[PDB]
């Protein structure tokens, strides 16, 4: 199915998916 290499499941779900910036809440 989803061959997502941890891309859409460990990253960017970060640096934005984390906080639109990475942190700063």
Tab-separated table of C-alpha atoms in Angstrom:
chain	number	residue	atom	x	y	z
A	1	UNK	CA	0.000	0.000	0.000
A	2	UNK	CA	1.559	3.237	1.215
A	3	UNK	CA	5.259	2.924	0.401
A	4	UNK	CA	5.857	6.070	2.432
A	5	UNK	CA	9.403	5.574	3.726
A	6	UNK	CA	8.591	6.959	7.177
A	7	UNK	CA	8.148	10.206	5.255
A	8	UNK	CA	4.475	10.821	6.073
A	9	UNK	CA	4.778	9.193	9.489
A	10	UNK	CA	7.921	10.553	11.121
A	11	UNK	CA	8.660	13.781	9.258
A	12	UNK	CA	6.825	16.917	8.223
A	13	UNK	CA	4.104	15.467	10.231
A	14	UNK	CA	6.961	17.505	11.687
A	15	UNK	CA	8.542	20.933	11.120
A	16	UNK	CA	4.942	21.937	10.621
A	17	UNK	CA	2.939	19.009	11.493
A	18	UNK	CA	4.860	19.561	14.710
A	19	UNK	CA	4.108	23.284	15.162
A	20	UNK	CA	3.869	25.178	11.858
A	21	UNK	CA	7.562	25.903	12.559
A	22	UNK	CA	8.791	22.908	14.632
A	23	UNK	CA	8.087	24.213	18.146
A	24	UNK	CA	7.205	27.546	19.770
A	25	UNK	CA	3.932	25.763	20.523
